């Protein structure tokens, strides 16, 4: 048996190019792995099987439409084998939480099998396979913090001097990325929504391990569109900052909010206040950067 621990991610910086055709938006983003994790345990078995436990687990498919299932099939095919493995996923990354939990699970399966089968292909081969499964899977392998400058680009590693402290808050329903992109386009047509600065100063603040320096640089060009669709996001973000967070942004298309705090102490205090206020379904504290998918039991 092999168990692999793997983190969810937050987007610290998300710049969205103007719409081209076929209506694609170029992105550059800073990914940040934090200590909300899934652990996936994999064992040799007679046939491929998949099972999940944890808060939202009930809802997820346990067949081919689950990325973790696809990962086991890809890994097996990569080495000419049948995916004769049982997969057990212990989820603490909130379901539909916008932290790429499904991608984290796929990354974890690649690692678990790599080790369980004593293949030990290089991590670079795993990330090659991860790119085939989905755009967030390679980061769940990489972990830490990384700059992603475009669709097919390799991740650039960003190392931090210090740990950062986060409050993550989740809504009871998601926001379709499609609908958020449409609104951002619309907002850019009728007006001039906030455009971010450059990625470099963000990496420099991360590298300095300095939350005061990083806080004003956090940003998401999709946030204005998400907030437009639900003005409540804007109140939640203000509530977190008023509770003491240095800054708050929505991560991704939303509605998940990430709050940067000064310390573990402040994060707990902010998280408890937000939790009490009931502006969100779920509140958790976390730290980053944390490592990507890795064996923790063998």
Residues 279, 158: Cα–Cα separation, whole Å: 33
Catalytic site positions = 9, 136
CB atoms within 10 A of CB 5: 21
Instruction: Show the DSSP H helices in 56-122 as ranges.
Output: 67-78, 101-116
Question: Would you list which residues are annotated within the binding site?
Answer: 94-104
**Long-range CB contacts (within 8 A, 24+) of 45-50:** 45/84, 45/85, 45/86, 46/84, 47/84, 48/72, 48/73, 48/82, 48/83, 48/84, 48/85, 48/86, 48/87, 49/85, 49/86, 49/87, 50/86, 50/87, 50/89
C-alpha–C-alpha distance, residues 201 and 185, integer Å: 26
Tokens standing for 63? 């067949």
Q: Which residues are annotated as a binding site for ATP?
A: 94-104
The angstrom resolution of this structure is 2.1
CB 95 within 8 A of CB 59: yes
Compute the distance between CA of residue 223 and CA of residue 233 in angstroms, rounded to an integer: 9
Q: How was this structure determined?
A: X-ray
Would you say domain 160-298 falls under CATH 3.30.70.890? yes
Question: Who's near 200: CB < 8 A, 6+ residues apart?
Answer: none
Handedness of CA 226, 228, 230, 236 (dihedral sign): positive
DSSP string, 32-48: EEEEEEEEEEEEE-SS-
User: Which residue ranges make up each domain of the chain?
Assistant: 1-159, 160-298
Protein fold of 1-159: Ribosomal Protein S5; domain 2 (3.30.230)
What is the Cα–Cα distance from 259 to 243, expressed in whole angstroms?
A: 10
């Amino acid at each position: 048996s092999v168990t692999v621990r793997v983190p969810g991610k937050v987007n610290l910086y998300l710049a969205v190019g103007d719409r081209r055709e076929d209506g694609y938006h170029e992105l550059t983003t800073v990914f940040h792995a934090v200590s909300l994790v899934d652990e996936v345990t994999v064992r040799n078995a007679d046939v491929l099987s998949l099972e999940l436990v944890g808060e939202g687990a009930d809802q997820l498919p346990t067949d081919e439409r689950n990325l973790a299932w696809q990962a086991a099939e890809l890994m097996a095919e990569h080495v000419g084998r049948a995916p004769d493995v049982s997969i057990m996923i212990d989820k603490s990354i909130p379901v539909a939480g916008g932290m790429a939990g499904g991608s984290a699970d796929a990354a974890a399966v690649l690692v678990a099998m790599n080790s369980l089968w004593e293949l030990n292909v290089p991590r670079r081969d795993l990330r090659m396979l991860a790119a085939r499964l989905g755009s967030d899977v390679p980061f769940a392998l990489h972990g830490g913090t990384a700059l992603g400058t475009g669709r097919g680009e390799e991740l650039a590693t960003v190392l931090s001097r210090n740990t950062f402290h986060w409050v993550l808050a989740f809504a009871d329903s998601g926001l379709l990325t499609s609908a958020v992109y449409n609104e951002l386009d619309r907002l850019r047509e009728v007006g001039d929504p906030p455009r971010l600065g450059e990625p470099g100063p963000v990496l420099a603040a991360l590298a300095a391990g300095d939350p005061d320096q990083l806080a004003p640089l956090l940003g998401n060009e999709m946030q204005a569109a998400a907030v437009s669709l639900d003005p409540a996001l804007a109140r939640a973000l203000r509530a977190g900052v008023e509770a003491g967070a240095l800054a708050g942004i929505v991560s991704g298309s939303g509605p998940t909010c990430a709050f940067l705090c000064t310390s573990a102490s402040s994060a707990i205090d902010v998280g408890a206040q937000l939790s009490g206020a009931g502006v969100c379904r779920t509140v958790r504290v976390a730290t980053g950067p944390v490592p990507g998918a890795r064996v923790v039991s063998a």
